[PDB]
Design a protein around this ligand. Structure first.
Ligand SMILES: *[C@@H]1O[C@H](CO)[C@@H](O[C@@H]2O[C@H](CO)[C@@H](O[C@@H]3O[C@H](CO[C@H]4O[C@H](CO)[C@@H](O)[C@H](O)[C@@H]4O)[C@@H](O)[C@H](O[C@H]4O[C@H](CO)[C@@H](O)[C@H](O)[C@@H]4O)[C@@H]3O[C@@H]3OC[C@@H](O)[C@H](O)[C@H]3O)[C@H](O)[C@H]2NC(C)=O)[C@H](O[C@@H]2O[C@@H](C)[C@@H](O)[C@@H](O)[C@@H]2O)[C@H]1NC(C)=O
Ligand SMILES: CC(=O)N[C@H]1[C@H](Oc2ccc([N+](=O)[O-])cc2)O[C@H](CO)[C@@H](O[C@@H]2O[C@H](CO)[C@H](O)[C@H](O)[C@H]2NC(C)=O)[C@@H]1O
Ligand SMILES: CC(=O)N[C@H]1[C@H](Oc2ccc([N+](=O)[O-])cc2)O[C@H](CO)[C@@H](O[C@@H]2O[C@H](CO)[C@H](O)[C@H](O)[C@H]2NC(C)=O)[C@@H]1O
Ligand SMILES: CC(=O)N[C@H]1[C@H](Oc2ccc([N+](=O)[O-])cc2)O[C@H](CO)[C@@H](O[C@@H]2O[C@H](CO)[C@H](O)[C@H](O)[C@H]2NC(C)=O)[C@@H]1O
Ligand SMILES: CC(=O)N[C@H]1[C@H](Oc2ccc([N+](=O)[O-])cc2)O[C@H](CO)[C@@H](O[C@@H]2O[C@H](CO)[C@H](O)[C@H](O)[C@H]2NC(C)=O)[C@@H]1O
Ligand SMILES: *[C@@H]1O[C@H](CO)[C@@H](O)[C@H](O[C@@H]2O[C@@H](C)[C@@H](O)[C@@H](O)[C@@H]2O)[C@H]1NC(C)=O
Ligand SMILES: *[C@@H]1O[C@H](CO)[C@@H](O)[C@H](O[C@@H]2O[C@@H](C)[C@@H](O)[C@@H](O)[C@@H]2O)[C@H]1NC(C)=O
Ligand SMILES: *[C@@H]1O[C@H](CO)[C@@H](O)[C@H](O)[C@H]1NC(C)=O
Ligand SMILES: [Ca+2]
Ligand SMILES: [Ca+2]
Ligand SMILES: [Ca+2]
Ligand SMILES: [Ca+2]
Ligand SMILES: [Mn+2]
Ligand SMILES: [Mn+2]
Ligand SMILES: [Mn+2]
Ligand SMILES: [Mn+2]
Lengths: 238, 238, 238, 238
């Protein structure tokens, strides 16, 4: 049996147990600022990611076991003009050597808009801009190897409000669940779908966040993570 | 700082750390069977509750602190005729000396359909029967001092399937969140509302379950709890 | 699988999840004061106990499993005259309906100085007074069904200093381990013994503390518990 | 607040969340085999280490906080000739970029036998060979920036038996405690000392094990870790 766990109720400068990629910085208020801010205003065409440094053991070919996990986090998206919000934030699992891909609507996760099994990506996206592959309206999506979500639900961005997210995986039912709550308005969202992690992901992955601002100057927003917990449990064989 | 925590992944036949009230028994399969079953069939006019034996310290007048908590459980409701399902199941917090109240649509929680501040009850209900005070259709409700829910959402019963529930309280925002997921159908439900526990509940409470079958012979269903975890954390001041 | 857990980093007045027996009170400084204090001075012939309210499931006859547990606590003993210290403090496990027994050197645990299997008591004692059944000098003891310890080690009371205790049970090896550290002086003590909990204790027990001051006026000391954590884990059958 | 936690009840082949250094391999029985074994016999002049991949945040200059931690592990040392056992095993904390140093009695931890503040090492050693700087007999030591222990206690190797170790740090008292239990013989050991982590170690460290066999062919032994848990908690200020 193996478990991994971590908690950040806020973030420190130079977090050596996080791998920061692209534009990500830690703010003086202790937030993970994934996309760039300049003179209090979000900057366009910005992309940042942040991964926990240790690989997570998500399944084991030796014992044919698959891990459960649960992650919680708080985030804020602040768009000066909510009608022009872009592009969004995602929580993801990827190969250990994962590097940032294309900006904008591809969210730093994918190189193009196609499905490719060699991506080995599972993600939950909080998508603020309708691209050609998207459903109508802002939405939460479960993504497997593609920016084109397996499943989505409508989600209304509450501009500059704290969102509390929980994402969990139950290996026994192969179900990934994602919920988002805005305590300020008592509004809440949830979806779940079948995702077989053993078939999608390598045995070890890195986990974390990615976010991108829009590719035109008036389609901008901030993407800040305020807090993050993660717990995984790879059980003993049957 | 004070914390309380417990886990049951199944139940043992004479659970001395649970206070069983009314008809509740533990089955040979290790389930908490809240309402009576006879020869594999649910019995009408049955009421059962089950509380954790230890009081939970949910707020402290000495330090003006309020606890967070999170509880998870799995339950099954099996109605032979889904159109005649009644009456439902609830998770609740109540005074330490709480005793079962009226059966049927009052769910063992209340003596009538009014809103009495001296009840000191907070509950999340899974309501299978439309009473005169209910919204149309089966629903999940957040209840404060009344069977008339403060907030409800529609919920479609998946008959005889395992439902996974999480209920959490965030003291800082005074918000109670409840979610239900059916992994078998990939359906999920969530709601949240403002509930100020310090104003509603005494400093110590008991926590647990209640359920009731219908008050006519053809309006019956089982209410079984399969597993239950609970964690509370009363922080230090500031 | 079943687990039980709790933490107190200090104690609140009227702790409704503790069963206080005999003279025990909670002080305004947040200590569990097991033996009586009057005008800042310890009172003789005082006996107090404190138990966690919920029974702990320590073994299960249905699945033939036995729990592991670990408890930690901090305590202070203050004797105005260290040469006349009496009688000491113990951590114990006992039947759920346990009531205080004889004061003084029997520590509220036993009715007499004999071994009796029907006591169903396991205790770790911090013994400050040499009774006729004791080894020479102040000592820590592991007791099973008798005030006459199975195993003891010498322990020098550091008067009015905080002692940090850890007591753990490993079911797989049937070993009970007890350690005490005084961080102020970097002095530490440890002992362990084979104790088969399934043979000694009922399936459910209560856990807690007991302490007694001496039965003559000049043989007195305080016994305060400052903090307490407990965790038990009853595994699934293998 | 920041926490890090992990559990291994056994080790899998190719553990990508461990940094293996020198001779370390994972065996088919799931053990961390720190020093080399050839045809069932320990090899001399062997050195191996194993570190958890993620840096641990042990103190924070921004908030002036210092972490508590607790680690538990099980290990086995098997010496074909117990009188010629060498050299031993240590648990340690070191800078994130730590690399194996000299073999033999320096345990892979140090380049020489001197005290040097720039080592930034805290270790608990299980020392099976008397070097010129050692006390008489096999011993457990607390080491700070030197192979010459700050404090030691006698320890008798129980050859090829499982030792259960717990090492904990209490920031409030700046005390490190280490205990070792052999459940097979009901033998136990403990020591503690003042170690100020903020003054010794960098803000982030790696944690893990090191072990070395003797530098002559007849002074050999195996060093296997069977299981390992670690938990750290860096609190909020105040
Ligand atoms: C809004 O919620 C409020 C809080 O629940 C309600 O107030 C409570 O209502 C209780 C009844 O439902 C009531 O308790 C009863 O007290 C009776 C006698 O009290 C005196 O005498 C005692 C000795 O007998 C003495 O020690 C006391 O100090 C009192 O001076 C007692 O006879 C009742 O017991 C009989 O009936 C119950 C069934 O309800 C049986 O369980 C019992 O065997 C017996 O046959 C009853 O006692 C309670 O019995 C169960 C036991 O576990 C409890 O510990 C015991 O208290 C209670 O006093 C009040 N509480 C307060 C703070 O007022 C309120 O109800 C209405 O208003 C009250 C004032 C009263 O008029 C009720 O009849 C009303 O229904 C709720 N309001 C509304 C509109 O619903
Ligand atoms: C027209 C313009 O000003 N900017 C548009 C930009 O145009 C140019 C013009 C010249 C050159 N060039 O290399 O010379 C390159 C790009 O082409 C971008 C790629 O199609 C538009 O990107 C879209 O921007 C949107 C916000 O407006 C969202 O961020 C949306 O997700 C994003 N689309 C994707 C697929 O990421 C972007 O709006
Ligand atoms: C057979 C029948 O019709 N039984 C019905 C019963 O009727 C009578 C008729 C005359 C008298 N009287 O002596 O004045 C007493 C009872 O009145 C009960 C109170 O309204 C009905 O209770 C309801 O039963 C439903 C299922 O049928 C649900 O369980 C529902 O939640 C429950 N209602 C409540 C408020 O709990 C019950 O169905
Ligand atoms: C005033 C006095 O002499 N009291 C003494 C008392 O005496 C009597 C006198 C008459 C009768 N009787 O059966 O009538 C019974 C007892 O006999 C006790 C022995 O049974 C002394 O108890 C011991 O006191 C010591 C401190 O002085 C320690 O507290 C010690 O642990 C304690 N011993 C025990 C076993 O609890 C107790 O001091
Ligand atoms: C085969 C033999 O006798 N080798 C011995 C070796 O001898 C020589 C002699 C001359 C030269 N030279 O540079 O010419 C090189 C090696 O000197 C080593 C340094 O003192 C002995 O190392 C000690 O070996 C012991 C077990 O025998 C323990 O492992 C002990 O911890 C270890 N000492 C240290 C400080 O690591 C080592 O035993
Ligand atoms: C062993 O302990 C139990 C309770 O812990 C006592 O009740 C026993 O007392 C003896 O048995 C009881 C039932 C009663 O008959 C009494 O007179 C006996 O002394 C006790 N056994 C002994 C031998 O002291
Ligand atoms: C303490 O350890 C460091 C880290 O390897 C050594 O470099 C130090 O050596 C001293 O400083 C170096 C730069 C060099 O000047 C050398 O001559 C010094 O000895 C070491 N310090 C000591 C005193 O041994
Ligand atoms: C999928 O990804 C691989 C690796 O980047 C690439 O070489 C391949 O051509 C992609 N598309 C396929 C197989 O259709
Ligand atoms: Ca999009
Ligand atoms: Ca109803
Ligand atoms: Ca004594
Ligand atoms: Ca040595
Ligand atoms: Mn999308
Ligand atoms: Mn309802
Ligand atoms: Mn004694
Ligand atoms: Mn040494």
């Amino acid at each position: 049996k193996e478990t991994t766990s971590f908690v950040f109720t806020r973030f420190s400068p130079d977090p050596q147990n996080l791998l920061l990629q692209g534009d990500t910085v830690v703010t003086s208020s202790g937030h993970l600022q994934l996309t760039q801010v300049k003179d209090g205003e979000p900057v366009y065409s910005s992309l940042g990611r942040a991964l926990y440094y240790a690989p997570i053991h998500i399944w084991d070919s030796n014992t044919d076991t698959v891990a459960n996990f649960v992650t919680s986090f708080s985030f804020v998206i602040d768009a000066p003009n909510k009608a022009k919000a872009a592009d969004g934030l995602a929580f993801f699992l990827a190969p250990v050597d994962t590097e940032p891909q294309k900006p904008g609507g591809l969210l730093g996760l994918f190189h193009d808009d196609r499905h490719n099994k060699s991506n080995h990506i599972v993600a939950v996206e909080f998508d603020t801009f309708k691209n050609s592959w998207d459903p109508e309206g802002t939405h939460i999506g479960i993504n497997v190897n593609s920016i084109v979500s397996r499943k989505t639900i409508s989600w209304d961005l509450e501009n500059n409000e704290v969102a509390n997210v929980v994402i969990s995986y139950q290996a026994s039912t192969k179900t990934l669940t994602a919920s988002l709550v805005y305590p300020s308005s008592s509004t809440s969202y949830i979806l779940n779908d079948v995702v077989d992690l053993k078939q999608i992901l390598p045995e070890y992955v890195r986990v974390g966040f990615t976010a991108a601002s829009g590719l035109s100057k008036d389609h901008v927003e901030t993407h800040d993570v305020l807090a993050w917990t993660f717990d995984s449990d790879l059980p003993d064989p049957s």
